[PDB]
Amino acid sequence: NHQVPIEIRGLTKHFGSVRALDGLDLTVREGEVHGFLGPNGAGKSTTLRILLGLVKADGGSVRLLGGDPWTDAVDLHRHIAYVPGDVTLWPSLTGGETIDLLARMRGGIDNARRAELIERFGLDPTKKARTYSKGNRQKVSLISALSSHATLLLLDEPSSGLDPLMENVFQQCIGEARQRGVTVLLSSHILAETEALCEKVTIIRAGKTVESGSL
Amino acid sequence: VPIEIRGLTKHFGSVRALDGLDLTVREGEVHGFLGPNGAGKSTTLRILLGLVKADGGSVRLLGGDPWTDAVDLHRHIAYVPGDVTLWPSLTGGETIDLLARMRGGIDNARRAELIERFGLDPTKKARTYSKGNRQKVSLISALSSHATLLLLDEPSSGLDPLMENVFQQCIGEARQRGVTVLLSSHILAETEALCEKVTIIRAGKTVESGSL
Amino acid sequence: HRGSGFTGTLGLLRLYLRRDRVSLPLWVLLLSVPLATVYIASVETVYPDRSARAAAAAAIMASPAQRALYGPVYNDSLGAVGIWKAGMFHTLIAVAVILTVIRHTRADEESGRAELIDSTVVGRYANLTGALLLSFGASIATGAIGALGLLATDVAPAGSVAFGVALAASGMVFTAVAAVAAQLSPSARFTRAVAFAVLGTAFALRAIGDAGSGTLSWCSPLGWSLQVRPYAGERWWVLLLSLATAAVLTVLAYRLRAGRDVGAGLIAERPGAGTAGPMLSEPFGLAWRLNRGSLLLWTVGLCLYGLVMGSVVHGTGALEQAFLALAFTMIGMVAAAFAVSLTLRLHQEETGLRAETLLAGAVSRTHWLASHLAMALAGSAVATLISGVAAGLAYGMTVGDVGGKLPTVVGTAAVQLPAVWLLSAVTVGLFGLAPRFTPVAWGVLVGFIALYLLGSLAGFPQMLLNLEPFAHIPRVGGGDFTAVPLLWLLAIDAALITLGAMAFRRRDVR
Ligand SMILES: Nc1ncnc2c1ncn2[C@@H]1O[C@H](COP(=O)(O)OP(=O)(O)NP(=O)(O)O)[C@@H](O)[C@H]1O
Ligand SMILES: Nc1ncnc2c1ncn2[C@@H]1O[C@H](COP(=O)(O)OP(=O)(O)NP(=O)(O)O)[C@@H](O)[C@H]1O
Ligand SMILES: [Mg+2]
Ligand SMILES: [Mg+2]
Known about the structure:
The complex is a heterotrimer, with 2 copies of chain A and 1 copy of chain C.
Chain A: E1 6-14, E2 19-28, E3 33-37, H1 44-51, E4 59-62, E5 80-83, H2 95-105, H3 111-121, H4 136-146, E6 152-156, H5 166-179, E7 183-187, H6 193-197, E8 201-204, E9 209-213
Parallel strand pairs in A: 3-7, 3-8, 5-6, 6-7
Antiparallel strand pairs in A: 1-2, 1-4, 8-9
Chain C: H1 9-17, H2 24-30, H3 50-58, H4 64-69, H5 78-83, H6 89-109, H7 113-118, H8 126-150, H9 157-182, H10 188-210, H11 238-255, H12 283-311, H13 317-351, H14 355-359, H15 365-399, H16 406-414, H17 417-433, H18 441-453, H19 484-504
Helix pairs in contact in C: 1-8, 6-8, 6-9, 6-10, 8-9, 9-10, 9-11, 10-12, 12-13, 12-15, 13-15, 13-17, 13-18, 15-16, 15-17, 17-19
The complex binds phosphoaminophosphonic acid-adenylate ester (ANP) (2 copies) and magnesium ion (2 copies).
């Protein structure tokens, strides 16, 4: 993968008359937590939908893990874990069943980490998924993504709805994931977890890159 | 005393969602409402709107019961949910106009001011809004009404720092003209700036309460 | 001041009214206009001399099979014989009103609109009252239009009013049922299944009563409409029954509402399992887990219907053939609706933001699609074959042998599959080219059903009735079997499916 998990050059996409992206650039470099900052309407989620192959790009080059995101979106997706901006679960499945189900279509779950993640996020894994408050509904995705085989994490506002302590447990989990050579791309609006976790911030404004570099 | 919860209690199945609560908000002040992810903060705000029907205790919202007097009280009250869902077909301006028609009143001189200040584009289908402009619809539809009591569950979620600053200034201006606010945050940085007299509940009961 | 629980009813009613403004007029006209322009208009051509009409009546009262589907004929007047065939319109209106009430009450309330609406100055009962007013208005308008159309013909004018009022009451009785069912569960599909189980039971009781003495047809809201007896001596007081059952139930639908909370039902929820089993590790396992109850309920219902229809076939093999081939077409239509819903599981999955969660993994777009497609193609086939087997066993026992009557009835059920799968193919083709317009497969199916019912009866040319699959199905038994149209109906299906698949891999999941 040329030791560069992500490499975007001149990305472009229009949604009709709306120019969502107009020349975005990125480069994540095998081992670092990368901050993906920008205003509302910048094009942060859309980029995360282009790396996953859900959406096709009108121009430029994208090289995810050394391959094409659009045509190779099955063998590259078993090295990747994804946390969406809007977390939606199946209302009939249990909380502990969704973790196992989601982690099984990726590279696979790790039962040593799963138990200690459920232990310290304080989740109740025997409870239907339509009774989770906005905060135990995010712990399901966080535990499912942080206990899996993944050499790249694409987190999209992963601490939305977490009280000051469950979002300090998450920082420790990310810090100890970075120790074993895991690459993280972190999109967020809280510039208090970005300072503590991330170096190499990257700020985009209207689909274009306006700032980049180490903190 | 707009809110005088004195002993609330709620069971859903065998789950003790609320086990004796003592919230008390007074006139013309911003009140914080904090707690971990099991406390019962979103349930309490649903009990005050007459949507959950608490199993015990006393609730005197604006001097009347929330369950049997809901329609009469809800013309002084605005609500911003933690999970904002709109109509995908309608437009942002159309949604605000429709919600103003149901509430039976709006302030257009403030509606225009908020629309041109939050940066909302009021001519776009609501299904194209990027989770930060979806919260602006609720914020504008609630801050531009005639309500004298606002209940905000998580008003600034998905908002970049500039828009969160704008929201803070808007809440300050609202508090200037004698408006009462009850705010659930999980963000102890806007709670410290906006409001005094926080209230913390851990397992469905109040643990501490008082001036900051 | 001046507030009650019914505030906001008119506003909610009008924003329900404008939501379905291309659907409500269409079916309101479809269930009322073709009563004087088709059924009564095409009785002076088929049955001219009155001496002939009487003969037709003597051929209905001497066959329980024909009067199980439609009901008895009590005299040889032009109106009675002409409108005998239109006794099926008392079930379609019930289906329509049930769907409308559930759609506007519980489907929205499951999408979070209840919180947004009720946080305003909108009463507690406004949402219920708006849907009830809409359904009552629709069911009264269809009856009024039908009566006005029938009053312009040369039939007796009293029976026309009686039929119109009976048609209105049949749809007013099954609106309270839909409301009471909607007050029950937090899931919309469970409420729809509960509402339709009552209608199925009522139809089965009505059929068993009609095909026999007639005592058992007094225990069902359907069959309270045929005993009004338009054109054959009107019993007016029977409508009072349909006015009490609607009033008693609709009060309950309010008493069940003044004690639930927005979002819940009547029974709290139970804990599940904290670990997934060895079956829920795949899109195939996930799709199976979501459709177990629907598959079981549809299978049981179709088996019971086949068991009921097979007993009346023999209370001369040139009439049991014609009745079995006519009775299994209805089963084919019901299984087609089953397939359409099991495939719309896919549109509901994507529009709920849960498709991007699955597709952001080592799942392909064709392996995900062919996990709901494989359930729609298999559940309908299993249900249809089980219904055919049950009908064959029931028919064989009442005749004397089973091994000579089972294979033919199984073949009759199995030759309906190419027409059933065509609607799954249409839904898959629509989901992949125009995903937003996926739910017009319902309109396509209703158009096919309407064409089949009102085709060779209003004089359409036999090149316009060829645009539907239910007319091309062969006839098993004796000769007349070709097996060519099936080969033309399978191929089409494959093509459509392929098209949809090829149009899904090159698209945006946005
Ligand atoms: N389906 C769509 N059709 C049209 N415009 C769209 C669509 N999806 C997104 N957009 C627009 O594309 C732009 C980029 O939005 P988006 O990619 O969601 O950025 P964003 O960073 O996620 N917003 P936010 O999450 O608040 O920071 C916005 O102007 C959207 O309104
Ligand atoms: N409909 C329901 N059925 C059963 N249990 C429920 C239901 N709604 C909420 N609960 C439970 O009741 C408790 C209170 O939830 P809730 O008040 O929503 O949390 P919260 O105060 O909002 N904290 P947060 O997750 O940050 O929003 C939790 O244990 C929920 O799981
Ligand atoms: Mg976003
Ligand atoms: Mg909450």
